[PDB]
Please model this.
Amino acid sequence: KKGSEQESVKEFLAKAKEEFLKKWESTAQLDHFDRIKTLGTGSFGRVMLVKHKETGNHYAMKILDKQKVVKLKQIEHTLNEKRILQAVNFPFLVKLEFSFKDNSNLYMVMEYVPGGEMFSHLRRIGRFSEPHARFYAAQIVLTFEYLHSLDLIYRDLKPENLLIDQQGYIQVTDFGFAKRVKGRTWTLCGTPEYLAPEIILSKGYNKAVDWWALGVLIYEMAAGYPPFFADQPIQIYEKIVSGKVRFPSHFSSDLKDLLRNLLQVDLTKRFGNLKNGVNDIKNHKWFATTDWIAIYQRKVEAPFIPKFKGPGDTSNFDDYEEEEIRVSINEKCGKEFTEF
Amino acid sequence: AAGRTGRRQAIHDI
Ligand SMILES: CC(=O)c1cc(Cl)cc(CCl)c1O
Model:
């Protein structure tokens, strides 16, 4: 039975790779949209809710100021993000619909996910119970199984990047650090609390950094705060590299065991990175109640369904300062963004 | 137990 299930996974991932490759070796303009509201911000731009004027459908538009994408690793990453998002297809990955550029900005237009960020729901309620955290963790496990099978590393797992859809399921956003990596890669990037020790130590690293980050995410969902917690990044890094983890007293023993095997500094011991790959995680006792196929098929009733007041509703997002979108008469950085 | 409770920005090169 479990063996038949594992043959079926191999069959699916073989088909998934064929479909990915066909798209990987292979659409609008700004005035086609009304800009409605800022949904989130970052050091290179913002994500806005927009309305497509012709169809009236709503979308999330990520706007990157080509000028602000200045540093070398910032531009390569932007190309990775667009090309990876156009080629992937998985139930828990946000769907890119358009991408285009103008004199000043780069634009990626994605489906709008109206339930808000896991981040704000978690911070409002404090922590998720273990079944609730498990439901989300299962979707990430399957998403990283998919990505990793395509030799894609994600590299920015955190609640800020996990949107809740109308059925209460996860949609992973922000592929800004995602990359095709057959073996190792060397960029020092990601979010401090979620970095694996080997990233912080300037060691060449592989997809096992995503499994470390899953341990951070599960811990943060179930505790309400992450395992390596300090006011400044250098203090966070020190805690990560020591790798000492203490757990809340309400964590089950099965959760602590799983987290000790994910938050493992020794790569020869880290779950997700061993002979049995992702199955050491999927077959762990903490996931014994998880019906992995039913999660993929979205047959499991979600622990939380966001309320939606209609299309274009932004009530599940925080408010941000709005700043007019200015497009220059002079094209900026044309040669550096030719492939976009 | 003091740590960062708001949204966390990613770092690109350091
Ligand atoms: C797709 C979507 O709604 C969305 C996408 C990104 Cl990259 C960011 C936000 C705010 Cl965190 C979104 O709301």
